[PDB]
């Protein structure tokens, strides 16, 4: 009983837990839970987009390395 | 992006500087159609009818 | 009070306000709210169409600049 150990888990349960967490994070800072709008996710996605944009530029430079080879000490 | 990369690797360098406005506006135009646009059949509500 | 300050807002609230703005604007010029047809929209859209045509023409001009430049002498 009590769910001890590392048992397998259903995908339906994964979003369930992640939902209760977001709701709980809001209570600590906004002290309310009506959540007409959910800024937590909106604010999080913007960071993911920035990191993603940075990786794209690195691929560009890596691609440039194959178009016109040259070198520097490393 | 491949066409631009293909042209830059070919050495035409025509898209350098101000010439870049063509790929740029096209890329933005595609973005407007894919992220916004309009709702489907189950979204019968819209500004003209509401 | 209620409604004061910079609180959050939703997409349904944005159209709701723009509807009230259009409806009140004509009430100042036509003294009736029937709004059988909405000429303000059309008059406004007409300007946007005008602006779009100007941008299209100058991009057309920029397209002309690369196809037959000034430096082709002799």
From Swiss-Prot, chains A, C:
Domain of life assignment: Bacteria
Compartments reported by the entry: Cell inner membrane
Transmembrane segments: 47-67
Segment forming the signal sequence: none
Positions in the Cytoplasmic compartment: 1-46
Misc remark: Part of the eccB5-eccC5 operon, which is essential for in vitro growth.
Subunit annotation: Part of the ESX-5 / type VII secretion system (T7SS), which is composed of cytosolic and membrane components. The ESX-5 membrane complex is composed of EccB5, EccC5, EccD5 and EccE5.
Family membership: Belongs to the EccB family.
Primary role: An ATPase (shown for residues 80-506). Part of the ESX-5 specialized secretion system, which is responsible for the secretion of EsxN and a number of PE_PGRS and PPE proteins, including PPE41.
Protein name in the entry: ESX-5 secretion system ATPase EccB5
The organism of origin for this protein: Mycobacterium tuberculosis (strain ATCC 25618 / H37Rv)
Gene behind the chain: eccB5
Region of the whole protein represented: 10 to 83 of 506
Curated annotation (Swiss-Prot), chain B:
Transmembrane intervals: 15-35
Signal sequence annotation: none
Disruption phenotype: Mutants are defective in the secretion of EsxN, PPE41 and PE_PGRS proteins.
Location(s), subcellular: Cell inner membrane
Quaternary structure annotation from Swiss-Prot or TrEMBL: Part of the ESX-5 / type VII secretion system (T7SS), which is composed of cytosolic and membrane components. The ESX-5 membrane complex is composed of EccB5, EccC5, EccD5 and EccE5.
Reported function: Part of the ESX-5 specialized secretion system, which is responsible for the secretion of EsxN and a number of PE_PGRS and PPE proteins, including PPE41.
Miscellaneous comment text of the record: Part of the eccB5-eccC5 operon, which is essential for in vitro growth.
Protein name: ESX-5 secretion system protein EccC5
Organismal lineage: Bacteria, Bacillati, Actinomycetota, Actinomycetes, Mycobacteriales
Gene: eccC5
């Amino acid at each position: 009983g009590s769910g001890y150990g590392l048992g397998l888990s259903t995908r339906t349960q994964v979003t369930g837990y992640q939902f209760l967490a977001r709701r709980t994070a809001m209570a600590l800072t906004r002290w309310r839970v009506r959540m007409e709008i959910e800024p937590g996710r909106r604010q999080t996605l913007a960071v993911v987009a920035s990191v993603s944009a940075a990786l794209v530029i690195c691929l560009g430079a890596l691609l440039w390395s194959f178009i016109s080879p040259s070198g520097q000490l490393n | 992006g491949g066409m631009v990369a293909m042209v830059f690797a070919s050495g035409s360098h025509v898209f350098g500087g101000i010439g870049s406005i063509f790929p740029l506006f096209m890329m933005v135009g595609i973005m407007m159609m894919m992220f916004r646009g309009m709702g489907g059949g189950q979204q019968q509500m819209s500004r003209p009818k509401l």
